[PDB]
Structure 1
């Protein structure tokens, strides 16, 4: 005989019925990097801890009027 029932039962007791696979469709020829988590910085310290001030304020921009004839 084949004893297909009983060799299924053999396979059951010896492996424990965890015996199939979830086959995944995979269609792309190329596999790519999964898109994952990307934080932004939370520094324990600032880089320089003091903002530099307005470099380019107006009183510093405008140096001079010209006083020439043209």
Structure 2
């Protein structure tokens, strides 16, 4: 005979009935990388230790006027 009630109890005592896994169905036939975190650049030091002063100020932009006859 099967002793059907016992076979449940058979696996019960030696394993502990935690035999059911769960699965999540992947409807997509493919698989790509999960959108896991991408953290933010918060350094210890700064990259060049000084904000550079303005390189292209106006007094540098205009180099000369012209005094010519056109």
TM normalised by structure 1 equals 0.94
Tell me, in whole angstroms, the C-alpha distance in 2 between the residues paired with 1:40 and 1:20.
Answer: 40
Which residue does the alignment assign to 2:57?
Answer: 57
Q: Cα RMSD (Å) of the superposition?
A: 0.7
Partner secondary structure for residue 17 of structure 1: coil
Tell me, in whole angstroms, the C-alpha distance in 2 between the residues paired with 1:35 and 1:3.
Answer: 50
Which residue does the alignment assign to 1:22?
Answer: 22
When the two structures are aligned, how many residues end up with a matched partner? 70
Unmatched 5+ stretches in structure 2: none
- Once the two structures are TM-superposed, the CA of residue 63 in structure 1 deviates from its matched residue by 0.4
- Once the two structures are TM-superposed, the CA of residue 39 in structure 1 deviates from its matched residue by 1.0
